[PDB]
Design a protein around this ligand. Structure first.
Ligand SMILES: O=C(O)CCC(=O)C(=O)O
Ligand SMILES: [Mn+2]
Length: 201
DNA sequence: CTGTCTAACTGCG
DNA sequence: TCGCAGTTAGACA
């Protein structure tokens, strides 16, 4: 309850803190201890004709048989684990929404980042929201309008994502706006992000 | 065969 | 420290 509502032209989102420091610290430790990340061949993507190692670590968990694909990289979900189930069920019991898949991004520090994109693929249940839960260091998250890089120019939306926070990205946000987690060199500590989604069978 | 798009980078300013 | 400009060991419709 008591969400901060992020609203603009074709942008509907909401931000809330889910946990206090003591709890979120406990979940963060467990994530650090328990999550396994893809390496080598499953850590490379194809963008602008070139193959790049990703500047971060990624993991996927979810219901058996599923798959997710972005930028010429196809990831297969590992079976659920308690710490992840715990978070999922908490987000479910607060939003009403259900989820069968989570992508985990770990930025060891402000050098690690994700370039701007739309969480795009049609393998994603249409109309469904995306649940972004963040642990560890606060990191600036940035929204930017599609046609703004620039015919008619809507203002960029900056937002800090805190320890134990939840960002909800409701439809139609992801058709209209791009998002990135830009480099911040002042940031020395790790951060783990869990974006929960609903995937089609 | 044309045009729209790119979850990433270097090399700047 | 930040982020813009210009992408392209090109994909795809
Ligand atoms: O790091 C985040 O806050 C979200 C990362 C992201 O954009 C994604 O999981 O696709
Ligand atoms: Mn994303």
């Amino acid at each position: 309850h008591s969400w901060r509502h992020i609203r603009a032209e074709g942008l509907d989102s909401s931000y809330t803190v889910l946990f206090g420091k003591a709890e979120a610290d406990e979940i963060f430790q467990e994530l650090e201890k328990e999550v396994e990340y893809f390496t080598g061949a499953l850590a490379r993507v194809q963008v602008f004709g070139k193959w790049h190692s990703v500047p971060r670590k990624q993991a996927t968990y979810g219901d058996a048989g599923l798959t997710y694909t972005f930028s010429g990289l196809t990831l297969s979900p590992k079976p659920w684990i308690p710490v992840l189930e715990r978070i999922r069920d908490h987000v479910s019991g607060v939003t009403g929404q259900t989820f069968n898949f989570v992508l985990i991004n770990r930025y060891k520090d402000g050098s690690d980042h994700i370039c701007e994109h739309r969480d795009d693929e049609r393998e994603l249940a249409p109309g469904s929201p995306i649940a972004s839960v963040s642990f560890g260091a606060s990191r600036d998250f940035v929204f930017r309008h599609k046609d703004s890089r620039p015919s008619r120019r809507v203002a960029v939306v900056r937002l800090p994502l805190a320890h134990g926070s939840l960002l909800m990205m409701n439809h139609p946000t992801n058709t209209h706006w791009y998002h990135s987690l830009p480099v911040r060199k002042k940031v020395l500590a790790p951060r783990v992000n869990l974006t929960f989604r609903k995937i089609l069978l």
